[PDB]
Symmetry: C5
Subunit: 257 residues, 5 copies
């Protein structure tokens, strides 16, 4: 694909605005946004996580106005929605000490977002290659011990919700030329969430050539993970807690040959 | 609104200077700036926080000189007032160890401020959709399990003091075009307050087009939350502690069509 | 004050260099730089801290060469905390971190603050607990009410005396201080580690958005500081604030005003 | 060699893309990416770590198109592969409290990468000069007590994979004129991993004279260490855990005398 | 008076070297470590042994014989041997049952200076009644005012293994001809955070474009790199230090 000039005129720009809800596992009708309580297998060999215990990547395919011209994604505004909810330290929590408030959501977090002109490309990496992934999830197949470091057989597209567990897939750095992705994993059982909100921050999506993601077949792909940490119940059982992510993307028409 | 030229001359500028007091709950006549001690529900179903246990958003609607021209907010200086009061570790606190000083205010904090030409627009997000919020508060209504992640029915305006609880409302990123907002949630029961003060820092409120918040009906809206963390008393009970926030806003007259 | 041109020539510039010592309470003849051990009241209403237990703001009023009305304008500042390495003494009546271990170093809540102005720093009182009874010899918010816990505009003062204004009840008043530049950081928490940077290569410019620095009324420069580094914990677990001196070097130039 | 002009035009640029797998010790057929559990010696004199307990530097030598012209390395994109695998807190782990999730990978980390026109040059520094290093590793020889601080006899080239223990060797700052290297050691038993991923960040490899690494013999040398921390099993045994590193390097032909 | 920079081939030189740490070296096997730290019963009985006190390191480097003076312009510097702190298998105290050894952690001081003369020091004491040992150079005639500021305590960093870190800091009222940088990170659980790269340069020129000017053709390099404490199996703790690399570029400058 050869990239030519940007179109101008009022008609030449468009915006997409939406939110992606988290997919933390939702273990019952009351627990949307939470995983099932986390349990620990006795050995690597016996690791067989329940589906509702595994957070998944979120994805949305957004149809754009029908258009050779392509929509080019230029800027992104994004934020995590509902950061203050984590101030509820009075709901079935475990007191930090005698008479204390509830232990807040804390521990390992993964905050990730991407904007692309096609589905996010994934590479599988397993903590433990013998983990048995549950029916209903899409996971690295034919895993070997090399899957614990790098097995190039594990290639996928983020093309379905509630399907791709966070713990076994990452953005494939060898691909994704037509996507911009950003993530941070903060590990450790006591790490505190640090969540910033503002409507004043824009990320520019253009590459070093001044070209943003180009939307193949007039579709924009948005992906997210916002595992904020773990909620600890009074019993001490812990569940992942996630929040939704807002996206606002500006796009312009670009001619290509 | 189509935006035209800025008015110049001596008459063309004005200043708003004020402070917003925190609304932490004020459980008795000696505890302005604190919440009621936090207690924890037995279950998710039975979460029923009392009003004096819930910090709320602060808001001031400031009338501007009567003026088609509109006042445009251009710059902000802001500061948390009384940061050193958190050095009082000698006042019914809980000794950190035998013979030690009192445990200082620490734990989950939310520091938030916004400047707008109209009320801050809020989206509701609930940690637990089954929480019964108390009489005298304004809270997400007709909550469903989906309210734990994103229920678009929960839209409100920050239009009343000591009413909108921090934990169930955030700025609505889908709206707020005429407001600039900034916030940080730092979670974890042991996080240290880190509070900077200076009279040398200015925030510019202009958007990417060089336009600040435009004050409809000649009112400026200022909003804040400064939950600094929790105070732990001698018996281990914990209360939110908040502080006031200073605002100084420079405004100029702007013609609109 | 209408601010006119800057004077030039050899005679037109001057320097102020000094250190301000901390005022932590100094409970005896051997404990300069420390507070008395901290004790805790059993109720808010019985919080009666002793004077030697309360860190205070430090202030220095520095006479400048005597001076159409010309005023000395403060333009740049170099500053740093003096004696940072002293906190490496972990062998001196400290509480061992664990069996056979070294002494716990100074740590916990810090307040690091400095200001340069052409008049006394202006203060606003805010109280953690309005019923705290501050001791004789300190200058404290008077006629305190429960509103003093968040904002009571009656509590206005000038930082105009050393060893007198307790840190915990006063802050720079953001509604005033047009003729001062101030900078402070509170880091709270009992386990917080001191992070103290030193260098002779860092300068802070004191000019405001209009290119004007503090103008020294009556040819006096006002320097203020607090450097509570944390608490020292002794063998028995008693804790005392520990403070350090602060170095100031300020460059000034002559400025005509109308 | 005098460095002359860059060649421009059709085949004057080339690109190298690969991943380096971690060499953490791999104590059995199921544990690629992990070390053997760490044992502690009784005294300094008796320190004798087994080969499979010692992470090693990784290196790859990449042949470039055959070319006086030399390939010049100009830019690097790099990232750690499989960051999300650290969210597996459900297998063979040690609960962080009664009924809690498993303790995530945490503690001492070393993240390091280099790009050069020849092998990374190493200087040996030993924590304990009396450590008996195992057969099959390449370590500072003829160690003396000075080796604990600086013994200039300890020079090596990172010229073999799975051979040079991380704890024995650092990049030699007195050499490496023709390499760019970057590393961070984060110590402490409880430090949280903080791992950022993005395809939008580039490192420029040019020195202050605008010259990048020049590839002798048309070979590019890539080196890495990514010890992310330690995994703790149910019984408290701890093992280093490493992850692969992606490299994409852009190169240009440079004329030299 | 500082005049113009000399140019041409012969007008630049570079200095490269390492400074070894001076942590106390309590025996023939423990270079880079202090003696185990012990704690006095009271302030008035504080009497640290020599081998328990880390000291400032200093090197005076002779430059090519040259009024011209060598001017130090840039610096590249890093801590050498950062990865050695990954030895958690050597007589350490297990973090928990069956765990690895606790790594080096706790209070650190990382400091370096480049000057055209000895670094000037000001003394400040944690406890003025500390009895400092024979073989160290320490603030003399100490009073309670030495705990905050006693201008009597002035010295030059003119000897290795002599000036204890805890007694002395760079004197900010002097050092016109030196550039110095240091960070104290306190607290007993503080994790070392150590960066290495050959791509970072510090410019030594002041606001007037003038770097340290080397009196008598000597360059002065000083360092402290106390990385933290190593805890042994029995809980005893010792300071651990590491060497520091310096690369300095100098140019000939005419002075009056």
């Amino acid at each position: 694909v050869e990239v030519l000039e940007v179109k101008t005129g009022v008609d030449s720009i468009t915006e997409v605005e939406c939110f992606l809800t988290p997919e933390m596992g939702d273990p019952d009708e009351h627990l949307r946004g939470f995983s099932k309580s986390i349990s620990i297998s006795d050995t690597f060999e016996s690791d067989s996580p329940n589906r509702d215990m595994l957070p998944c990547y979120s994805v949305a395919r957004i149809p754009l106005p029908n258009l050779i011209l392509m929509w080019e994604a230029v800027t992104l505004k994004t934020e995590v929605i509902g950061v203050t909810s984590l101030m509820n330290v009075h709901s079935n929590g475990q007191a930090t000490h005698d008479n204390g408030a509830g232990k807040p959501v804390q521990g390992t977090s993964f905050h990730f977002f991407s904007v692309g002109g096609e589905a996010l490309e994934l590479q599988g990496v397993l903590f433990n290659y013998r983990t048995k992934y549950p029916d209903g999830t899409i996971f690295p197949k034919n895993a070997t011990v090399q899957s614990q470091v790098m097995n190039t057989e594990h290639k996928a597209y983020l093309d379905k919700n509630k399907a791709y567990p966070v713990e076994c897939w990452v953005p494939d750095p060898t691909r994704n030329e037509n996507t911009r992705y950003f993530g941070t994993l903060t590990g450790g059982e006591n790490v505190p969430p640090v969540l910033h909100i503002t409507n004043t921050a824009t990320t520019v999506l253009l590459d070093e050539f001044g070209v943003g993601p180009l939307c193949k077949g007039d579709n924009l792909y948005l992906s997210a993970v916002d595992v904020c940490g773990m909620f600890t119940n009074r019993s001490g059982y812990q569940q992942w807690r996630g929040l939704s992510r807002y996206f606002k993307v500006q796009l312009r028409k670009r001619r290509v040959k």
